[PDB]
Design a protein around this ligand. Structure first.
Ligand SMILES: Oc1ccc(-c2ccccn2)cc1
Ligand SMILES: [Mn+2]
Ligand SMILES: [Mn+2]
Lengths: 137, 137
């Protein structure tokens, strides 16, 4: 069967600024770069940045809610979010509708998130404060 | 410090066919559903389906190369690809890289992949046959 996420590939319009964002700003590990892409890791996540002439810098009001959340500890969450804010990283959402989260954009407008907590923790929180119509299996 | 992918959220135009696709066709575990979304797991992956009237059913020629690859064993790959083919799931690319890959579309045109092989395997292959301009770190 399927066992998890093998990799996340993000199309990017300008490879060097995107590598700098993920490695320098977000702290991910850079493993390789070539003329058309890069491979990074974030814990167990394999991230590919793929140079794509079709990628457009997309304002958040123009894209749907598809987004990519990265795990961060409770102890690190606020200072990391505040550092992104002080660095001028653009945002796309403020209401914490799914727990402790900070929503921000990559250079091409990919929708990113910092989140504290596991799926189990989110299910437990939702039992007390459920989304409308919520059913648990 | 970021420790991994916390969750992947896909915007969906119609919740029921998307739940059917990820749970029934792709075998993921459905943990909860509400009026505007669902939570599933696939191994360590926390997947959220979010009902979004902004999501367009998008032909693959009209989206960039951003895509989401799921892990599968080599032994299971061919029968899972055959399952997707029997269900009439569209393919958006042929494999030309190392490791088995099947490139398929979700009901809204999200670009998905089945892949066999880790980042370590890819890096080893690349060291032996580097892409144009490739540098390792
Ligand atoms: O194809 C390449 C082009 C540029 C680089 C690079 C990496 C780090 C810093 C500056 N340039 C690597 C490979
Ligand atoms: Mn989220
Ligand atoms: Mn891929």
């Amino acid at each position: 069967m399927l066992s998890g996420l093998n990799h996340l590939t993000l199309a990017v319009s300008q490879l060097a600024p995107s590598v700098a964002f993920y490695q320098q700003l977000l702290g991910m590990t850079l493993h390789a770069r070539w003329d058309s892409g890069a491979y990074l890791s974030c814990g167990d996540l394999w991230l590919c940045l793929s140079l794509d002439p079709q990628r457009r810098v997309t304002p958040p009001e123009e894209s749907d809610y598809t987004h990519y959340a990265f795990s961060i500890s409770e102890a690190d969450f606020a200072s990391f979010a505040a550092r992104l804010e002080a660095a001028g990283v653009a945002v796309w959402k403020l209401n914490r509708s799914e727990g402790a989260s900070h929503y921000f954009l990559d250079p091409d407008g990919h929708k990113l998130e910092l989140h504290v907590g596991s799926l189990a923790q989110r299910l437990a929180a939702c039992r007390e404060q459920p989304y409308k119509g919520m059913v648990f299996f």
